[PDB]
Amino acid sequence: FNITETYLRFLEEDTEMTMPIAAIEALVTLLRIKTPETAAEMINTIKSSTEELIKSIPNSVSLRAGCDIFMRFVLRNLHLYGDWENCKQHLIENGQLFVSRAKKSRNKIAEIGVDFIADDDIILVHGYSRAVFSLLNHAANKFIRFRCVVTESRPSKQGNQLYTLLEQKGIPVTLIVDSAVGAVIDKVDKVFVGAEGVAESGGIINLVGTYSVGVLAHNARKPFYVVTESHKFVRMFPLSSDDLPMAGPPLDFTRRTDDLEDALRGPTIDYTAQEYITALITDLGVLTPSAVSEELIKMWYD
Amino acid sequence: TSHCRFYENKYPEIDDIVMVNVQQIAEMGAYVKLLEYDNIEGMILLSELSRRSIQKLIRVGKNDVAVVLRVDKEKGYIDLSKRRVSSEDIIKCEEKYQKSKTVHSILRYCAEKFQIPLEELYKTIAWPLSRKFGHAYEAFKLSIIDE
Amino acid sequence: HPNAATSDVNVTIDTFVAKLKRRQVQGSYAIALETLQLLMRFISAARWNHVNDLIEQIRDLGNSLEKAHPTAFSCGNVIRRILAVLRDEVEEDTMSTTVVAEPLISSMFNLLQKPKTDYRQVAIQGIKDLIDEIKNIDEGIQQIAIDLIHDHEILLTPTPDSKTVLKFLITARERSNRTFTVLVTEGFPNNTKNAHEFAKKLAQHNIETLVVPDSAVFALMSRVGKVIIGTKAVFVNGGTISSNSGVSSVCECAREFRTPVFAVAGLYKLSPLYPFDVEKFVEFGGSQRILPRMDPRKRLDTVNQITDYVPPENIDIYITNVGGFNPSFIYRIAWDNYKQIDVHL
Amino acid sequence: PGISSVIPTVLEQSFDNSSLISVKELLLNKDLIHPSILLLTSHLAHYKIVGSIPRCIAMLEVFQIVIKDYQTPKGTTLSRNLTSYLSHQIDLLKKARPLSVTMGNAIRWLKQEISLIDPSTPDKAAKKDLCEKIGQFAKEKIELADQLIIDNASTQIEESTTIVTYGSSKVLTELLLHNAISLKKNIKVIVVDSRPLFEGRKMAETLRNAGVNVMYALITSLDTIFNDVDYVFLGAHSILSNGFLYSRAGTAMLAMSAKRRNIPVLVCCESLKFSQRVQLDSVTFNELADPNDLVNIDYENPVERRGNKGALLNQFIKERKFEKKKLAMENKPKGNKIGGKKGSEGESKDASNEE
Known part of the structure; x- marks a missing residue:
């Protein structure tokens, strides 16, 4: 029936219905066809389909995290030794209810996390996430004053994409390069960052220059933010500053070339430590440091 | 070679009681092997093996007590349950496992001496002893007193 | 309703x-x-x-x-x-x-x-x-707190206003095996009277008292052993609202000199609310107490604030009736006493 | 009853928080104490191998021997003079060497087991089940848990890597031995050592016996060896409520350098190692030892020289004081590998409430 093909069908779609929540919805559809009653026939084939999904992954982490939560919920269903049919019906229904929960959480956060942006504050935003931009839009809906500074992120020219999406709202902006980002931290009140993953330790899994932002802000004593939806938690512990799951290059040094083809290669995903984050915002209340780990301990029961 | 099932058919049924030697842990539950019904894998889930923290409990140790829930009689997929077995039945599960272990020990000298497959020797014994008499342990106790 | x-x-x-x-x-x-x-x-x-x-x-x-x-x-x-x-x-x-x-x-x-x-x-x-x-909070504090401070160590104290902290300090001075020098920042616009009563009660018990002007904090930070806060309210992220004046700078002074920061509080004093902005939470004082004469006060727009905020980056321990906890853990102590729904009343 | 008071060397003007004394050579004692305790106290007084982890394992086995040797009196029941006898053991252990955290959790477990079993069951049937339970308890919490630390570390360490270590931690010796033999990688292991105990020397010796590429160094020379180093493993003793690393001597120095020079510190630990006592500096509660171990002039533990130093009592202020157990600062370590898999030291007490 395929799961990778179902995820590939979301091209012109996206937004509101997030990338992990679309992968979880694809997991439920694959589950509900071939009988969820048998725990031997099904769970092994679910594990093989997740393994096939990881093998097809080029540069994504959150899909592996979203599978875990699904699994957990499935196992927790028949924890009460209930009817092997009513528990199954509740499991299949919690697929559309999972995607509906992405709406309710966004409704919660955009009313909680507007409080952090005070009267007339200049913001420097880096790493686009659906939660952080939803804060930015629903604060403009609240009729509050805020200035915005665009960071020139270089994965697939994300800065320009961010700049255009800010233009469609009615908030004054200008381009700032990630090289010169050090020269901005004095006229900026607060620095906001949207995450691709949050660590077991309390650190962050993010894009092509976020650790660099974290350190500079720690030097300038100016606050550093993480805002996300509560599903991007893996049991991952990057021990060092440059160690991450990759399908591509971990810093390659190429031979002598004249035609100029082999060059670009640099760490596209970078880690930052727990100390650099001043504040974290999710739908699971207002909490930052060890909170993430408590969540993970609460899930894994280990 | 150590193979062939203790009973007549390859795959178990519903409500029948078995004894497992743990070979796996965490995530799902445990893809393992049995000591009551064949040597192939039969999986269980963490919830079943808990009832009642857990990081000191099983961890592929000795033997437990489990009852078969779901059997696939097509390719080979077995589901079990630990909690469901009652305290009075646990003693009966242990005695059947002890009986199965004695039958397996009996049908191993035969394969060693004459250098013939164990599965053929297990098949020729399990027709009057296991099916008609009741069990192979009590039939062996009858044979030693008076053949 | x-x-x-x-x-x-x-x-x-x-x-x-x-x-x-x-x-x-x-x-x-x-x-x-x-x-x-x-x-x-x-x-x-x-x-x-x-x-x-x-x-x-x-x-x-x-x-x-x-x-x-x-x-x-x-x-x-x-x-x-x-x-x-x-x-x-x-x-x-x-x-x-x-x-x-x-x-x-x-x-x-x-x-x-x-x-x-x-x-x-x-x-x-x-x-x-x-x-x-x-x-009874003091009984639960003294068993954790009077284990961390040594002989011949100098203690600098902002916020002398807290009844909790002074009584913690007197129980330690009761121990004849423990000797410590006390520096006290004045906190001019508000704490002055309370700081002077603080210095009086330390002399009453015969503890080496040192009254410090709010300018001289830097001029001593090389000699300071530890810093203690008399907080009013403690928060989710760790940070504190304290009982008025001259704390934030002292904590900034301590962190630059890498001098340890202590905080004495209760769980009822602990709050499940989050301080997203200091601008809203801090209460401001009366400028009347600074400068006399109102015709110059047309041109003399003076700024004074009562409550002072400390960010969690400075303090390390919150010794309560339960025990000593790190600011990166205090949220759990809070959730052990207050529910998630019981926030937005 | 025992020997108390009258101590060698000066009382000292600075650092006088703990006892500096005790019985090395056996003279004037009670004639009821079990000899396996008397052996362990004589061992730990001048021990070269042990460091937190192995001390408790030996303490458990000694207890198992005592229970096996224990025959219940006809008049007095099982929970009558046992707990007094155990209190005599701990007091003799305290006189020899200050106890670890893991030792305390063992005693607490044993005292819980005394209360659990009521004097009504037969004597031989009781102790047979008791020692079986202790054996299973030691299997789970130590041996199996250790194996769990092994595999958790195995995924974390990259292929062909340089590791700098310190101490004589049982968990790390087995870790590196597992790396050299089972996984077969290019592991360059550098070991550091202090003056009071040649713990790292012994570790390096055992690694050499396995056949490992080993460099051996000292604290004095570090700004040369580092300028190479990737992951640094530290022998845990106890992690407190805050998440401060209470460990052996030359630990924090290494921890500082690693934080400064990019590639950080990792720590392997046991679920039994965590305490609830908290502190922030090394002065708080230090494991002090007699300057008799620092008399020797370099090289080895027994050399016996007519050197430069000799006097301590008669000399007008000459405090040659060394410490054994120190505190690494909170932020500097990054990983902790325990029974419950993983977690940063910032989290710390997510195991104490989980029990």
Whole structure:
């Protein structure tokens, strides 16, 4: 029936219905066809389909995290030794209810996390996430004053994409390069960052220059933010500053070339430590440091 | 070679009681092997093996007590349950496992001496002893007193 | 819900409202005691028979109480504390009226799995236990705190206003095996009088007293062993609102010199609220106490603030009646006493 | 009853928080104490191998021997003079060497087991089940848990890597031995050592016996060896409520350098190692030892020289004081590998409430 093909069908779609929540919805559809009653026939084939999904992954982490939560919920269903049919019906229904929960959480956060942006504050935003931009839009809906500074992120020219999406709202902006980002931290009140993953330790899994932002802000004593939806938690512990799951290059040094083809290669995903984050915002209340780990301990029961 | 099932058919049924030697842990539950019904894998889930923290409990140790829930009689997929077995039945599960272990020990000298497959020797014994008499342990106790 | 129903039966609501607004009531410890006696009067007098209608009414009363006074966090916390004590016993009661409920530990994840009696008596005793907890905090502090400070070590202290901290310091000085020098920042616009009484009580017990002007803090930081905070209110992220003046700079001075920072507090003083902005939470003072004459005060726009905030980046320990905790853990202590819903009243 | 008071060397003007004394050579004692305790106390007084982890394992086995040797009196029941006898053991252990955290959790477990079993069951049937339970308890919490630490570390360490270590921690010796033999990688292991005990020397010796590429160094020379180093493993003793690393001597120095020089510190630990006592500096509660171990002039433990130093009591202020157990600062370590898999030291007490 395929799961990778179902995820590939979301091209012109996206937004509101997030990338992990679309992968979880694809997991439920694959589950509900071939009988969820048998725990031997099904769970092994679910594990093989997740393994096939990881093998097809080029540069994504959150899909592996979203599978875990699904699994957990499935196992927790028949924890009460209930009817092997009513528990199954509740499991299949919690697929559309999972995607509906992405709406309710966004409704919660955009009313909680507007409080952090005070009267007339200049913001420097880096790493686009659906939660952080939803804060930015629903604060403009609240009729509050805020200035915005665009960071020139270089994965697939994300800065320009961010700049255009800010233009469609009615908030004054200008381009700032990630090289010169050090020269901005004095006229900026607060620095906001949207995450691709949050660590077991309390650190962050993010894009092509976020650790660099974290350190500079720690030097300038100016606050550093993480805002996300509560599903991007893996049991991952990057021990060092440059160690991450990759399908591509971990810093390659190429031979002598004249035609100029082999060059670009640099760490596209970078880690930052727990100390650099001043504040974290999710739908699971207002909490930052060890909170993430408590969540993970609460899930894994280990 | 150590193979062939203790009973007549390859795959178990519903409500029948078995004894497992743990070979796996965490995530799902445990893809393992049995000591009551064949040597192939039969999986269980963490919830079943808990009832009642857990990081000191099983961890592929000795033997437990489990009852078969779901059997696939097509390719080979077995589901079990630990909690469901009652305290009075646990003693009966242990005695059947002890009986199965004695039958397996009996049908191993035969394969060693004459250098013939164990599965053929297990098949020729399990027709009057296991099916008609009741069990192979009590039939062996009858044979030693008076053949 | 308004106070139209509770007027002849309950009068003390409005007298507490009057005590807050005009600041007749003073010190978080006292504000808590009053709200306890308010909730004592609310249960003893009212007639409800229904439980869910009762709890939501209490929520609205607490919502109005915090809107009446924003700096009364001890007011807000005490209500929230009883609210959670109520909610657990109701959830225990609903399990018996319907008829595993014990997975492993007491976690969170309220987004995963779904769901006449002596309840009022439990509510009564729940208030009584809160009082006794607020009555005795010092006993729970001294067993953790008087283990960390050494002989010949110099202690610098902002906020001499706290009754809690001074009594912690006197129990340590009672130990003849422990010797320490005390530096006290004055905190000019507000703390002055309290700082002078602080210096008097230290001399009364014969402890090496040193009165410090708020300018001289830097001129001593090389010699300072430890820093102690007399906080009013503690938060989720770790940070504190303290009892007025000259703390933030001292903490900044300590961190640059890498001098350790201590904080003495209670769990009732601890708040489940989050300080997203200091701009809203901090209360400002009266500039009258700075500069005389009003015709120059047209041009002399003077700035003075009472309450001072410290970010969590500085302090390391919050020694309570329970024990010593790190700012990166204090949120759990909070959630052990207050529920997630019991925040936005 | 025992020997108390009258101590060698000066009382000292600075650092006088703990006892500096005790019985090395056996003279004047009670004639009821079990000899396996008397052996362990004589061992730990001048021990070269042990460091937190192995001390408790030996303490458990000694207890198992005592229970096996224990025959219940006809008049007095099982819970009558046992707990007094155990209190005599701990007091003799305290006189020899200050106890670890893991030792305390063992005693607490044993005292819980005394209360659990009521004097009504037969004597031989009781102790047979008791020692079986202790054996299973030691299997789970130590041996199996250790194996869990092994595999958790195995995924974390990259292929062909340089590791700098310190101490004589049982968990790390087995870790590196597992790396050299089972996984077969290019592991360059550098070991550091202090003056009071040649703990790292012994570790390096055992690694050499396995056949490992080993460099051996000292604290004095570090700004040369580092300028190479990737992951640094530290031998845990106890992690407190805050998340401070209470460990051996030359630990914090290494921890500082690693934080400064990019590639950080990792710590392997046991679920039994965590305490609830908290502190912030090394002065608080230090494991002090007699300057008799620092008399020797370099090279080895027994050399016996007519050197430069000799006097301590008669000399007008000459405090040659050394410490054994120190505190690493909170932020500097990054990983902790325990029974419950993983977690940063910022989290710390997510195991104490989980029990």
